[PDB]
Write a protein that binds this ligand. Structure first.
Ligand code: NA
Length: 462
């Protein structure tokens, strides 16, 4: 992706979008009990911790585009993956508006908590002013969609989250693009049944883990992934995507039965218009992280990409023996023979993708079931039930998270969520985690699950 044009919003008649510039994150009561290094992301230019130009840093992810046709490798990649998805009988019929807004099996109700985007954010109109869970009212929504239409600008927010010392200093804060409520709803109508099928079928047929429950899904992954593991990281995957990868996505959508008209919304993602505070800008390429379907579309594109690179370097490859599971940029994969990921990475660079060794580190290559991570979690077979696999979030990350809060009123839910991740690290680690929590008075006011209870419920869930 490439920023093609940027100017002051007022020149085009856009008001300044007044997005948050002060973090909602504050030290929790556990801040001194546990060790950690992470701090809130930089949200504004004048932040004293900056050791770089903020506005330059946050847009530096847009590294450019490679301008190419959809080549022979891409075409075969699309064919192969399309053949997998054909198995699922995805419906290209529009999802009914009520289902697409207020919830159905495989597609949770539209989040009423997030930004309603443009122009609502300039009018002080929130999602809850238009929508109502209790009523399932579609009347105001239909009015709004008729009044303002589709293809509205996206509103760029800086993500308010914890970041490493390095990412704070370098000003490498992440951005979220909020699609207008109008476009979110329209895309959910158009692609909702596809969203639904993906959510209901995480695994190696969709090549997707979006919507998965790691407590359950992790025992299935080594069964699905037969051979030598392949994993690598991307640097700035979303923003690196060139228009050619969106063309591939449109081709795969058409093979599923979507019409040229229905795939027009992919152009909205690819060639996008954004508002950031007092500026507005156009991007050619780049997945706008935050719009409807961007996790699923990022995953589908990743399925095309990896196959393309394999076909290009290993002309003798048998993709029918290749398996992969993506969650956006994150990938875990296998092939029955060793594959040199460093070769794939160089082929990736030719397509404007920046691929690096798995989980930082120096080489590409020797990934094992012991060191592989996916969705930030390691894989550890249960010692007693060896066919069941623990997702293991590092205690370091759990410690980082408990030291901060966006609202102390949520302490019970926050700490409980962390317990559900922590116990997979083993009984001794859990017991210590609970002891430290309880060394603060608040900690003794919380309902914390016992290890044996967590383990029992987990075992029973299968
Ligand atoms: Na874009």
């Amino acid at each position: 992706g490439e920023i093609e044009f940027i100017e002051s919003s007022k020149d085009a008649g856009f008001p300044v979008i007044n997005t948050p510039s002060k973090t909602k994150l504050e030290p929790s009561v556990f801040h001194q009990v546990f060790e950690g290094n992470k701090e809130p992301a930089v949200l504004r230019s004048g932040d004293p911790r900056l050791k770089a130009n903020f506005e330059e840093a946050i847009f530096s992810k847009y590294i450019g585009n490679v301008n190419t046709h959809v080549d022979e490798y891409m075409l075969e990649a699309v064919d192969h993956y399309a053949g997998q998805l054909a198995t699922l009988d995805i419906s290209t019929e529009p999802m009914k508006l009520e289902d697409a807004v207020y919830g159905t099996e495989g597609l949770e109700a539209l989040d009423l908590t997030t930004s309603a985007g443009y122009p609502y954010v300039a009018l002080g109109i929130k999602k809850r002013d238009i929508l109502s869970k209790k009523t399932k009212d579609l009347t105001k929504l239909k009015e709004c969609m008729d009044k303002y239409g589709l293809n509205l600008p996206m509103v760029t927010y800086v993500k308010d989250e914890l970041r490493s010392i390095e990412k704070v200093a370098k000003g490498k804060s992440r951005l979220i693009e909020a699609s207008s409520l109008n476009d979110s709803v329209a895309m959910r109508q158009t692609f909702g049944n596809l969203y639904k099928t993906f959510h209901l079928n995480p695994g190696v047929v969709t090549g997707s883990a979006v919507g998965c429950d790691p407590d359950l899904f992790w025992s299935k992954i080594p069964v699905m992934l037969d051979g030598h593991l392949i994993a690598f990281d991307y640097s700035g995957y979303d923003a690196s995507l060139s228009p050619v990868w969106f063309a591939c996505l449109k081709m795969i959508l058409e093979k599923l039965g979507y019409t040229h008209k229905e795939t027009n919304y992919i152009d909205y993602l690819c060639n996008s218009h954004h508002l950031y505070r007092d500026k507005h800008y156009f991007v050619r390429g780049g997945m706008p992280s935050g719009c409807s379907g961007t996790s699923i579309f990022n995953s589908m594109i990743n399925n095309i990409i990896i196959r393309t690179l394999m076909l290009k370097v290993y002309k003798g490859i048998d993709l029918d023996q290749f398996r992969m599971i993506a969650y956006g940029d994150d990938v875990i994969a296998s092939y029955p023979w060793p594959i040199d990921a460093s070769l794939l990475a160089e082929a990736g660079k030719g397509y404007g993708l920046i691929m690096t060794p798995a989980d930082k580190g120096e080489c590409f290559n020797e990934v094992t079931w012991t060191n592989v991570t996916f969705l930030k979690r390691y894989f550890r077979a249960d010692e007693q039930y060896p066919f069941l696999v623990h997702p293991v979030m590092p205690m370091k990350d759990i410690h980082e998270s408990i030291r901060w809060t966006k609202d102390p009123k949520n302490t019970q839910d926050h700490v409980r969520s962390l317990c559900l991740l922590a116990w997979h690290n083993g009984e001794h680690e859990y017991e210590e985690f609970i002891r430290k929590i309880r060394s603060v008075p608040v900690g003794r006011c919380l309902t914390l699950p016992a290890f044996s209870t967590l383990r029992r419920k987990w075992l029973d869930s299968f």
